[PDB]
Amino acid sequence: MHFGYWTPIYGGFLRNLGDEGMPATWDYVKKLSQLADRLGYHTTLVPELYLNDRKGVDAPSLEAWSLSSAILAVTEQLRVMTAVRPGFHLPAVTAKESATITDIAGTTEAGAARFALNVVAAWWEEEARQYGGAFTRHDDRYRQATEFVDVLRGLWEHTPFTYEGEHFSVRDSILSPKPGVHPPVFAGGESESGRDSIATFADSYVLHGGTVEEVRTKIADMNARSQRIHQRDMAEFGMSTYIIVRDTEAEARAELARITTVDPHSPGYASFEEFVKNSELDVELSKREYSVGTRGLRPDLVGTPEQVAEKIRAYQDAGLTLLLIQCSPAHEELERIAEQVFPLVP
Amino acid sequence: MHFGYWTPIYGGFLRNLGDEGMPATWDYVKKLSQLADRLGYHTTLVPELYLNDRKGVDAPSLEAWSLSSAILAVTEQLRVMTAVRPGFHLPAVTAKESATITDIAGTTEAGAARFALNVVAAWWEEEARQYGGAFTRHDDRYRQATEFVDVLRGLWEHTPFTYEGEHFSVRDSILSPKPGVHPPVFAGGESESGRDSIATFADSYVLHGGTVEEVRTKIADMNARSQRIHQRDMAEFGMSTYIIVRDTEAEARAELARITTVDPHSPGYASFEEFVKNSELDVELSKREYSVGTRGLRPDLVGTPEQVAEKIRAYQDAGLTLLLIQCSPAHEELERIAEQVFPLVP
């Protein structure tokens, strides 16, 4: 079980509250990344959005690729998983940028790649209008993600590489040097049609917060699809989840109530209606499920370190290999998890 | 007189030779950037090209934006001037990436911006075919650079910002937070039609290697254009030049002969014909002028520290405020310049 966390690029993760002692500045991100790297966190997910989807469109937010490159230059072992939307990027330029970031980061002590990519869809239509991104329809959305990954892979292995497609196309392209260890491709998308495409192009899978049976079922389904396409199980499985660990379960449950106290005028839910409309997920999201992220409290990792470790161990047996923890304040909470929960989860 | 230098992203600057003890790796770039920052170098120019134009298309090369972000995270005072081609970027995404890099870098002791942009044209047509860039020519090339900068400026000052143009367009776009000190816009382009557009959108000007009279005339011409458009002189003037400093002038001239020894099988001149065709400069380049860069040896800063300092002082009186020095090996040569030439040039 690898322990990861979300990098706070929006000044927090709670849509009901404002200040969480997590400023959206490089000063805070550097301190947090260096602390997590020292504590033994395996990976950090840096989401890619040019508008703050947690505190309001006008609230301060950091750019994913520049921040990711800077984090890797000031850390030693922490892997940086960076999100990427095909509609906002050229795959040939992205492949070159990724190879350079692989060199800047190097590899872990065991020779594993310190940089990964999360192929996410541009669900926010207003963000695409504002930042000039190509908004795609769900069947062509999954085909644009396949073509983008085919060009990334093709350039990292072949010299020259040529590709022809409806969304992306390259002619006799030369990329030198190739990454030492190629960045692993992670992807998330619960559409039934998209599940087959994601099983083909991605190495590992990302999932939103769910119960132990929902996670076991979805991991088994993805491995079955990957077994029919490539004759292999998927390399890693990460779940985006919110964690609340305290000395007593009553303190943990009091903090749950505090963060779920709905403020009617909170601008955090600006992107909620657009997420419901243009994020084709199997089950539609409610306003309460969008309080800390995308079903961050559904796994219910709220309690004492022993209780939370017991729940984490059940996800490990269900097939989960990585957690992508959302905290508040992350500088104090990630240290608490490292000290109290990490030894209990082998 | 501010002393700057070119970051070696192609494994050297000499098209006639191969190995220059300057590997195109982050290990070398980090050592070089940290050394230059300690020595007192003001700025470093990181060119943007996805193919190696100095050692052959298939030779190893580093990506400009990821490397620039990583350099700024590991330095304290050195400013990083990064090149940007409008045909390979979305100006709204570039404005956000630039604001985040401004936060990662912070400011110098005097409160000046540690990140600058060099608006360069996509002259390499084969590179645009390979990496999916939008190749423009003539009035479209200069109109695309004006629109790109108008969107960058508009997003850094106004909230929301709207722009309409043939190349770029944005609708009610929100960018938060704005950079503390906006990145200064540098530009290079000797076309007479392009000179008026560059004087309008850019804060400072970049020039290729030239004589003291060529530089004096061109700086005066640019300030006269800027005076008619904005009623002000341009902020800075940088010249890309190659330097050779030795204890004796005979040693310096022997090194000049060594680096200008043409090798018939050198793959460095792969982009020479395409540079001559699609660069759009007042004077066409010869093969000998493309040996170390773009007329890097035309200023002739070859000699003893006293002789080279005397020549630098004449450029300072002609109107030049910044040098963008090309070295080989840069780790030894930039230290030599800092020790011997820096005190002689006040």
What is the helix content of chain A? 25-40%
Continuous helix count of chain A: 11
- SS content category of chain A: alpha/beta
User: Which strand order do you get reading across the main beta sheet of chain A?
Assistant: 1-2-3-4-7-8-9-11
Shape of chain A: globular
Oligomer: homodimer
Report the strand count of chain A.
11
**Order of helix and strand elements from N to C terminus of chain A:** EHEHEHEHHEEEHEHEHHEHEH
- How far apart lie the N and C ends of chain A? 7 Å
Total discrete domains of chain A: 1
Main β-sheet of chain A: number of strands, strand sense, barrel status?
A: 8 strands, parallel, barrel
Q: Would you tell me which CATH topology of chain A applies?
A: TIM Barrel
CATH-level-2 architecture of chain A: Alpha-Beta Barrel
Protein name (chains A, B): Alkanesulfonate monooxygenase
Pfam families (chains A, B): Bac_luciferase
Enzyme class (chains A, B): oxidoreductase
Organism (chains A, B): Rhodococcus jostii (strain RHA1)
Please, could you describe this protein's structure?
Two copies of one chain form a homodimer. Chain A has about 350 residues and is of the alpha/beta class. Chain A has a single domain (about 1-345), classed as TIM Barrel. Helices cover about 40% and strands about 15% of the residues of chain A. Chain A has eleven helices and eleven strands. Chain A has helices at about 25-40, 65-75, 90-105, 125-130, 140-155, 190-200, 210-230, 250-260, 270-280, 305-320, 330-340, and strands at about 1-5, 45, 80-85, 115-120, 160-165, 170-175, 185, 205, 235-245, 300-305, 320-325. The first copy, chain A, has an eight-stranded parallel barrel with strand order 1-2-3-4-7-8-9-11, surrounded by seven helices. In chain A, strand 2, helix 2 and strand 3 (about 80-85) form a beta-alpha-beta unit. In chain A, helix 3 crosses helix 5, helix 6 crosses helix 7 (about 210-230) and helix 7 (about 210-230) runs parallel beside helix 10 (about 305-320). Chain A is globular and about 60 Å long. The first copy, chain A, starts with a strand and ends in a 6-residue tail after the last helix. At the A-B interface, helix 2, helix 3, helix 4 and strand 6 of A face helix 2, helix 3, helix 4 and strand 6 of B. Chains A, B: Its EC number is 1.14.14.5. Chains A, B: GO terms for molecular function: alkanesulfonate monooxygenase activity. Chains A, B: Pfam families: Bac_luciferase. Chains A, B: Keywords: Flavoprotein, FMN, Monooxygenase, Oxidoreductase. Chains A, B: One of its GO terms (biological process) is alkanesulfonate catabolic process.
